[PDB]
Design a protein around this ligand. Structure first.
Ligand code: HEC
Length: 305
């Protein structure tokens, strides 16, 4: 795993994520705002290489917040740990939402490193959706009471000649993006539920806008991982004399960030209907995004056809 992605990939415990807009703003908006400003600095968006350099410069300029590994976590099953280990994930002590900002910037850099060198085979609209998911996450975290504004995403060159195990690199780095987006969407959905419960219609609307933008980013990430997985299957046609090692795979049951996201989404049904009744257009477009993300599990998740 260390030969295919920068690890440890440090992430907080998703069970600790804030659950209200005011709590989220207090926890992360300062640091997210710094991240957004770094990624939108003069020259950062001229081309993909500039965005990569801006991402690494932004990461370096941020105050470190981690306090080392969580270590012994009574809430973490062995199967949770195995799921994390398979992708080089280390659950890290510290402010969970600030660690999410760090993880988002690191996952972005991981994606851009490969794309700057080897291009991408993704359709330009999928590339825009995928990378745009980072702008949605960080822009929303910078000001959770407002919908986030989309930004320019430089295009990726056409895919170059295959290098050994590049598909595995994209597979693993893509899953690092999954974990960031799952936490982000869990945050947005929790804030939607809380705002609706408290009758905060503007807060529900902003949270729903974030949830949909993050859901579209997740769909783009699933397309990116599906492209990597298909290439992986082709590299697997060769029989090997050494024991054949399967690519790492997420469990579903034992992937904590996804479990937290799904539980939030389940409890949000009434908030989505209430937004509809209050004149929002977000429920209908979120429903479309949700359907597309679900269908795009096919060819990525081992528990789908
Ligand atoms: C395989 C492990 C994956 C990975 C790589 C992703 N998810 Fe997804 N997901 C998975 C399963 C087994 C299910 C269905 C569980 C069941 O059958 O009961 C889902 C479903 C979802 C849904 C729908 C939830 C709902 O309808 O309430 C969503 C929204 C979802 N998953 C999100 C999601 C995202 C955003 C992912 C990448 C960032 C992602 N999943 C990956 C299993 C898997």
């Amino acid at each position: 795993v260390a030969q295919v992605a920068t690890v440890p990939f440090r992430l907080g415990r998703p069970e600790e994520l804030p659950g209200t807009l005011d709590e989220l703003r207090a926890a992360v908006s300062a640091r997210a705002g710094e991240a957004v400003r770094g990624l939108n600095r003069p020259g950062a968006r001229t081309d993909l290489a500039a965005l990569l350099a801006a991402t690494e410069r932004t990461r370096a300029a941020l105050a470190p917040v981690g306090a080392g590994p969580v270590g012994d976590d009574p809430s973490e099953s062995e199967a949770n740990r195995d799921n994390d280990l398979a992708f080089g994930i280390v659950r890290t002590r510290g402010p969970v939402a600030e660690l999410l900002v760090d993880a988002a910037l690191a996952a972005l850099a991981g994606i851009l490193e490969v794309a700057v060198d080897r291009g991408s085979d993704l359709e330009d609209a999928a590339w825009q959706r995928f990378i745009g998911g980072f702008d949605a996450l960080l822009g929303w975290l910078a000001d959770p009471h407002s919908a986030p504004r989309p930004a320019t995403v430089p295009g990726a060159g056409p895919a170059g000649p295959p290098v050994h195990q590049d598909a595995l690199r994209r597979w693993v780095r893509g899953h690092h993006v999954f974990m960031v987006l799952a936490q982000g969407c869990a945050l947005a959905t929790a804030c939607l539920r809380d705002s609706a419960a408290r009758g905060d219609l503007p807060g529900a609307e902003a949270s729903a806008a974030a949830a949909e933008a993050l859901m579209r980013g997740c769909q783009g990430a699933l397309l990116y991982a599906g492209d990597a997985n298909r290439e992986q299957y082709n590299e697997q046609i060769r029989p090997t004399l050494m024991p054949p090692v399967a690519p790492p795979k997420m469990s579903g049951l034992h992937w904590r960030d996804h479990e937290v996201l799904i539980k939030e989404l389940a409890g949000s049904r009434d908030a989505w209907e209430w937004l509809s009744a209050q004149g929002s257009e977000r429920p209908a477009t979120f429903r479309a995004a949700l359907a597309e993300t679900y269908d795009s599990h096919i060819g990525v998740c081992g528990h789908f056809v």
